[PDB]
Amino acid sequence: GNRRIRSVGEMAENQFRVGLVRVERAVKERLSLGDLDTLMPQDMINAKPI
Amino acid sequence: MNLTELKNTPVSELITLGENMGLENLARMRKQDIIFAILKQHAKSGEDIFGDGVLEILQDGFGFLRSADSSYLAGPDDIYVSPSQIRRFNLRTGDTISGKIRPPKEGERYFALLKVNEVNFDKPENARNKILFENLTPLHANSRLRMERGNGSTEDLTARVLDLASPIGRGQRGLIVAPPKAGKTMLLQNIAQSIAYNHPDCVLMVLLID
């Protein structure tokens, strides 16, 4: 009752979040200069970390 | 601070201007590095720059704005433009564009186009409302382009014989067939002078290859 079991799904979601926080910091520092009418919501995101 | 304002004045004005701005000796650099360093040091004082140039499409997707000072070639002062602007505002080769520009940002090496203001001497809002070239219906020339000055100068004869030998019109297809050292250069110069005098509304451009 005090020991919890985690499956592959929970670990995968955890690692997805670990990558997502890095991509979040990246998109936040990239949004510091992006203005209106200059970029589509595609270039600010990279595949690398996640 | 516009790009053309440094694009057209001779190298000497650039020399005195940079020597006034407290520069490293600009006489050691090329015209393009002259304008590049001057625009760098101007933006280093905190000014938003304006610029202009003709667009060239590259195969990697992005485009580059060239000037007539470099005869439309690659240079340090060419303005980089992203492919997505070419998408949204419907850009392509030949579109001359003037608008907001900034020097290359941190780690970059070419100017960036912020805000489009004039596309081929038009509003960028109507620039998307254009007709293509191959979809055009060609015709023969109907409007006469009179080449005679009417002042009767000594060289003007070479123009009047034009109106007597081979008439020209808007959209004409003309071929000059002549051996070397026969007088093609003076003929072409008189053609350009007469067109720029009698028809200043039509844009006039000249190609000199090799």
Ligand SMILES: Nc1ncnc2c1ncn2[C@@H]1O[C@H](COP(=O)(O)OP(=O)(O)O)[C@@H](O)[C@H]1O
């Ligand atoms: N209208 C003119 N009046 C006087 N001289 C002329 C005229 N047209 C041509 N010339 C002579 O011809 C020469 C032109 O040389 P160039 O421009 O090299 O001819 P091309 O381009 O046909 O080789 C000049 O040296 C000039 O003296």
Ligand code: BEF
């Ligand atoms: F005909 Be020359 F070479 F201009």
Ligand SMILES: [Mg+2]
């Ligand atoms: Mg010649």
